[PDB]
Amino acid sequence: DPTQFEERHLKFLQQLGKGNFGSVEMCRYDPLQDNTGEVVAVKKLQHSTEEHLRDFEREIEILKSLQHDNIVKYKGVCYSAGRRNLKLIMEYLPYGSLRDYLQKHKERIDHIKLLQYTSQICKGMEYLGTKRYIHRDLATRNILVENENRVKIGDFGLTKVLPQDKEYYKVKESPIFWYAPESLTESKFSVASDVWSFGVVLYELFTYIEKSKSPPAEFMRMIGNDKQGQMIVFHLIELLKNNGRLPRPDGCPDEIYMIMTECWNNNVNQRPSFRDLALRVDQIRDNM
Numbered sequence: 001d002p003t004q005f006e007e008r009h010l011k012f013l014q015q016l017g018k019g020n021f022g023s024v025e026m027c028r029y030d031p032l033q034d035n036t037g038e039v040v041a042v043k044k045l046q047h048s049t050e051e052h053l054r055d056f057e058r059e060i061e062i063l064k065s066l067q068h069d070n071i072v073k074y075k076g077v078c079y080s081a082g083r084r085n086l087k088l089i090m091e092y093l094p095y096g097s098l099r100d101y102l103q104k105h106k107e108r109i110d111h112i113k114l115l116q117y118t119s120q121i122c123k124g125m126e127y128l129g130t131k132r133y134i135h136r137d138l139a140t141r142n143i144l145v146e147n148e149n150r151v152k153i154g155d156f157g158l159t160k161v162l163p164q165d166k167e168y169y170k171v172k173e174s175p176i177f178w179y180a181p182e183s184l185t186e187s188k189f190s191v192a193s194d195v196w197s198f199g200v201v202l203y204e205l206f207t208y209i210e211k212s213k214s215p216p217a218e219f220m221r222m223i224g225n226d227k228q229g230q231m232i233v234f235h236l237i238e239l240l241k242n243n244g245r246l247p248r249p250d251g252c253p254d255e256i257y258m259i260m261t262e263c264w265n266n267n268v269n270q271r272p273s274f275r276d277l278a279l280r281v282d283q284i285r286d287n288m
């Protein structure tokens, strides 16, 4: 509906974040011009092209097709510049990314909270899988915090729909330290490579985003911090194929590390499902 969010009533409140190809703003949609209205987040392209606009349309369709408690809510589209451009309207989550939240609000984070967030992420990913969507960018920087009891998966800019006849999508066009080995070596993405990335997400959570413990910092320390360019990927592949893995974070229960290591299976079909993982995590919590 092109009259639902008219550019003239979308009022700027704050800049939230700019990347190479996207920017997000906090705005208030004020149809009565009474300095009220709903607070929303507005995503727009940066450095746009016809191909990026097309991908942006697919991203908007993906988000609109999702209705789940642990997925950022779609609100609509603004057809700005006299209906010659597109902006995506979605819900605004006050506490930002989970990565920043873990750094900033460690005073209210403990293992119980970490496993609650883990559970909610798994459920959101179960939901995504029923649409046969592959997120391809799961990371705590892309999970958002509504409040201390609720997180939601966001940033569907890399999300692909499986072909009807296949259980993987082959990208022909990269957060390499969250990638499964078969994504690095064959460009194959699947629910199982999303489960690999989720193991990296679980690792991040239990590192509490301490300095020098991020997956890039740890992998680079293992590979050699001097390495530059493609040699980095070469070494990353060789490491992963022969069982090199992120270490257990200090303070991390062996049981939780074992979840990480089972997600990090080189054998694509032996990784657990998101339903397995949700049940296992909620049973750990309920058994606690």
Ligand SMILES: Nc1nc(Nc2ccc(S(N)(=O)=O)cc2)nn1C(=O)c1c(F)cccc1F
Residues within 6 Å of the ligand: 015, 016, 017, 018, 024, 025, 041, 072, 090, 091, 092, 093, 094, 095, 096, 097, 100, 142, 144, 154, 155
């Ligand atoms: N829908 C949404 N809500 C927010 N909340 C937010 C974002 C940033 C902050 S900040 N600058 O650290 O204080 C605080 C709250 N982000 N968000 C997004 O889609 C979003 C994203 F996915 C990636 C980058 C930026 C975004 F904006």
